[PDB]
Amino acid sequence: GDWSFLGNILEEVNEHSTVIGRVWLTVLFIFRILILGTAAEFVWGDEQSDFVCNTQQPGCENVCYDEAFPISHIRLWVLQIIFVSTPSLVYVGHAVHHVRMEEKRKERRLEGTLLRTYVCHIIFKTLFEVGFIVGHYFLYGFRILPLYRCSRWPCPNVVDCFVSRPTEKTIFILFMLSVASVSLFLNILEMSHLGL
Amino acid sequence: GDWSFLGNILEEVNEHSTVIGRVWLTVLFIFRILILGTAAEFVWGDEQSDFVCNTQQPGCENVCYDEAFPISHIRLWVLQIIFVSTPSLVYVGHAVHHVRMEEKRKERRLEGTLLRTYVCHIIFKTLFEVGFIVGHYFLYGFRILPLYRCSRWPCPNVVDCFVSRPTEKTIFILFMLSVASVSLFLNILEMSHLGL
């Protein structure tokens, strides 16, 4: 996973953001992207290969892994990162559009419409963070148990399947939840600081 | 997969495109290339290794995977990305050719023929996006089912084969479809904005 493109564009908008937005962005780079690439990706690497079911039924392990894990937590966190970063991109686009307009108009900072855009970007970041948190909760909760019982066809009756590294995965699930909540708190502080 | 070459050339044509073309390009980099490399590629990594068929027939799994998946979705999205990016390259080539001509002629922006070229590039992008969407639909639809039934020789009669990660794959199929449709809408907005 090469995050160079997103990185370069978000460090562009480091220069154009509040101090609390610079903290938010540093958190995104260090506690989410870096963790994902240096730790979480390896934890989930053998998610299906080490998933085992007590059965001689061909196909059962496939369908039971798929039912237990409709989308891997790591893919969900990738999507979360991209969607929470998208409003920053929108804002920096608006800002650069104004810089190029000012240059052109001459040929021919957080005030006015850039403030409304910044506040909206904060709002959307907050809502997307909340949405991904809630979705994670309803999909998986915040704990992976070792045992998963499966009755999906072709599995005969109910079969016992065993998850890879449930405890390490639980630790990283809770870590990512905490990081997301810190991000939410930072966004709240941004709104308060702007208001006051 | 190293997209550095294409990246550098398309960020060259960031400078020479409309604001809506800059949004289109950002979408290409973040929601297509980045997703493909940080998420989709890993989802499809074990596509054949975890594809299983209920048979003792040598060769059957090979032919049944090949019949179910004549071309992996990820390869199809790579091709789509390159073909939808090709008209941008043509346009930037025309533009740089005019810049070098102007420099030479001196030794010796979206107006005139560059406008016709830009509009044609938008048209071709739209048509290629539509073509890849339609091709995806006819080849696979927008859902991967866990079970695939196969009667290709050497398989005896009909055999039941089971796909790897059908649900996660379905999620990413729909995600990529939505991103492609957003790109189409952006191209339509480009044509409208130019007209008006």
Added chain:
Amino acid sequence: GDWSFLGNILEEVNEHSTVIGRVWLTVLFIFRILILGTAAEFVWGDEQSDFVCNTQQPGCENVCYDEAFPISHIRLWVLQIIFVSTPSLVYVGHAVHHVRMEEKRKERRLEGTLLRTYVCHIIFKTLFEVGFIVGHYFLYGFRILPLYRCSRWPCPNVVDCFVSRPTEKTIFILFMLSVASVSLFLNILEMSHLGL
């Protein structure tokens, strides 16, 4: 596969080539190198590991894969890329040699001998492209069939072996053939444009 060295040297000779040579080079970077690294390499990744033969004979699968695939298509395309790029390197070497000579002589563009060299480079590119196309045809044709029948010792009598991903491989074989033919047409256009 790291193509950085070749890339840097061929983007050096972007500056010193015709507009049609810049199109040829862009095609080389995007439709050949990029495809190879982002798509084809993964398609052929399990070429021998998923090659299966219906036999209990030790050694047979090894010799039958080797007879079916004396050289993988991807290695052949790597060689093709390097050989079709070599004349460009020769030409840019001649050109830079003249630039350094002019600088020296001062201490002490496509005209003259650089034109003869450019035309010769086009000729050699054309001949190498044709040669690799013809060699591909005679070695493999343009279709990989699922079944390969093998009688190489130690295989007893004739054994049935099954190829990995024959259809996807056929798609990429035809795609690379088309890209090579486009390159040929571009070289022809270069010669015509120079003549006229």
Added chain:
Amino acid sequence: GDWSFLGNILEEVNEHSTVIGRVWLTVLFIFRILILGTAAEFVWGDEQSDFVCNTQQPGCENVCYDEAFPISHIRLWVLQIIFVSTPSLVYVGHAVHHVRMEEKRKERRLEGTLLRTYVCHIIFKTLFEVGFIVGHYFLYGFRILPLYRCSRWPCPNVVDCFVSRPTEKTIFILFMLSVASVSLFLNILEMSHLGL
């Protein structure tokens, strides 16, 4: 694992730190990050794949690996690196915030509040290092024994499981402990040097 982001930001704060802080940072880069990526990661690569248990019970190896290794040492060292680096980031943020304020105020080094912040950053680094050391001790100690006995369900009675590379892992555990303790000593020297 790509540490480029963190690296660039910590080499930013090389310029703004004491000589002993530059030694601490060099130790972080060379003896922790570099060791982790060039050595430790490969030692732990086959941690679960080569973990074996003497049993015919489906699921037992999964639960026994998970009980023996709730979190891999390498993931724990990644977290440790990030948390001990976080206060440096806070300090450099404060410092750069003051530099940008001074620039602005003009439009309109370790003294004052930057000294309090630097001392606090040292304190937090020390406490986090101590906490990770203590946590490592209580979780695993400083030795990995080859044999792990496991009675977690579904394992019948007590089963004997065998760890991959216990001795090499013990060597690297002790090496990382020593490096952490050197870092602690460096922080103590920082506080003393500032006081005197």
Added chain:
Amino acid sequence: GDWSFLGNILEEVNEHSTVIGRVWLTVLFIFRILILGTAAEFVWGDEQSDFVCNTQQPGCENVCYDEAFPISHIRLWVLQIIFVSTPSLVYVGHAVHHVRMEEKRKERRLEGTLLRTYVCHIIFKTLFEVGFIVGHYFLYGFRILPLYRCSRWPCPNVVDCFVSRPTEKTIFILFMLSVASVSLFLNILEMSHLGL
């Protein structure tokens, strides 16, 4: 395999070498290093994993692979590349040492001792190339046959072992031999051009 260090230093000595030395260096980068990383390394990737012997004897395949392939061709070509590049490094060191001396002496091109050093560097390159060619011949010849017969203990009597991809390996062996011989011819031309 990261050749960045060697690359940067040899492109330093591009600037300080003859035109024929620039051709030699381009050949080294494109036809040896690039081939090795984009093609040969993958051909030899499954050298031991796909090496099979017709035996039920534990250990036999290990000892028979080791006897057949005391050193993989790819490792031998890596060593060859480094040793044939070493004299270039010596020469560029001498040249830069003279440049820094001239700068110093001021504070306080291929003529004289730099010519003797250049000629010696050519001589050593030639001798090392010849030595690696001869060593390759005596160790393996220039053909890998599919069958290798092995009588090394613990193998009982003589066992038949089968090599992975003998034909593709033979093609690349001959290709690398030809590239080495081209390098030799280039060195001879260097000596002649200097003499005349």
Added chain:
Amino acid sequence: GDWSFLGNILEEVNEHSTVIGRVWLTVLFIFRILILGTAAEFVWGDEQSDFVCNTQQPGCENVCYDEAFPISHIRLWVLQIIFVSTPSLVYVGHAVHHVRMEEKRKERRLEGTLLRTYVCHIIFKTLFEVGFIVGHYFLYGFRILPLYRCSRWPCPNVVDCFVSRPTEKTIFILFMLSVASVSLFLNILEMSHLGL
């Protein structure tokens, strides 16, 4: 393994070292780091996966590999590289500290204390090189034999285990020993050149 950090810092101290220290550093980059990453790492890649023992005893192969190879040669060479490079870092730190002091004092080369530091750095490099050589000898000698006999529990009685690629490993062991000894000779020459 990413050596970029160490590389950049050691090429910083290229500028501040003797000619013999520049040779030592080039040897470190080319004959140790580059060999390790382009050759040795692949030779040792299947060290445990291809290690086989003639036994039906669960756990025996694990404990016997661990007893035969308490620390892989490649990890030992990584540690050696870092420790022999550490004194260079100390010296360059002292030198840069003096450069920044001189700049400051103005606001307000190998002579004096920098000579003592340089000599001490040479001494420590020599001692660490000798120590790693001696440790290698006592741990493994300079030859890996194919057969390793093991009586570690749970292995019943004495079992015969077979090492992966003993001959290639022996070649690289001797190569690295020779490179280390060349480094020692270079350090001796440094001391002599400084004395005379």
